[PDB]
């Protein structure tokens, strides 16, 4: 995640193993139950896309759901690209590039790039955009997996 250091700057720090394991354990115990979404939200505080793929990729089991989510993440990403067209002409030397759906999904962007966008002024909340897609896709799952 990207956290604030004592000095008063935003720097990246790694997520903790008993945080990781707590994510694992939630999924083990409460599967598709709604409490998973606030839980997720708390444990995703200050998290990167990269950390969010890590959390999704580290799941075991419920592979039908994991595939449905993936496909929702790509749909929501396809929709990001649709709604926000690429911008006019070449990229400025003085500036950094606008993200695509795949940069938001973490796929085409690097960590330093993910830190550029979030730490820069104005900052862009690429975590929160992926977060809604995850929560939206979580609703899809919850609604389906209701019996």
């Amino acid at each position: 995640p990207i956290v604030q250091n004592l000095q008063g700057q935003m720097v990246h720090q790694a997520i903790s193993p008993r945080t990781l394991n707590a994510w694992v354990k939630v999924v083990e115990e409460k599967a598709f139950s709604p409490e998973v979404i606030p839980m997720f939200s708390a444990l995703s505080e200050g998290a990167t896309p990269q950390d969010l793929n890590t959390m999704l990729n580290t799941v075991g089991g419920h592979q039908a759901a994991m595939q449905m989510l993936k496909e929702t993440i790509n749909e929501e990403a396809a929709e990001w690209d649709r709604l926000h067209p690429v911008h006019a002409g070449p990229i400025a030397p003085g500036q950094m590039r606008e993200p695509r759906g795949s940069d938001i999904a973490g796929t085409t962007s690097t960590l330093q790039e993910q830190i550029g966008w979030m730490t820069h002024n104005p900052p862009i909340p690429v975590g929160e955009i992926y977060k809604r897609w995850i929560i939206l896709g979580l609703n899809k799952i919850v609604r389906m997996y209701s019996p």
Binding site: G61, H62, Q63, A64, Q67, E71, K140, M144
Partner: protein, 74 residues
């Protein structure tokens, strides 16, 4: 176990089968295009006659929530 050996039981819910499929698909390392081909093809082909029948009625263009809700009573 090979991906061709993944098949749906005569009493097995599709759901439990689809989970098995993307787990084994998760251990295949092939190009995405090939894995897309496997998705639309092999999944339905090794699906049981009762659900297979159901899935034929969804036509093409179908997505996983609609397949998964389509074969639920079977």
């Amino acid at each position: 176990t090979s991906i061709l050996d993944i098949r749906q039981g005569p009493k097995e819910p599709f759901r439990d089968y689809v989970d098995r499929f993307y787990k084994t698909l998760r251990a295949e390392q092939a190009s995405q295009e090939v894995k897309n081909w496997m998705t639309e093809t092999l999944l339905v082909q090794n699906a049981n006659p009762d659900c297979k029948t159901i899935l034929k009625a969804l036509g093409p263009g179908a997505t996983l929530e609609e397949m998964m809700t389509a074969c639920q009573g079977v």
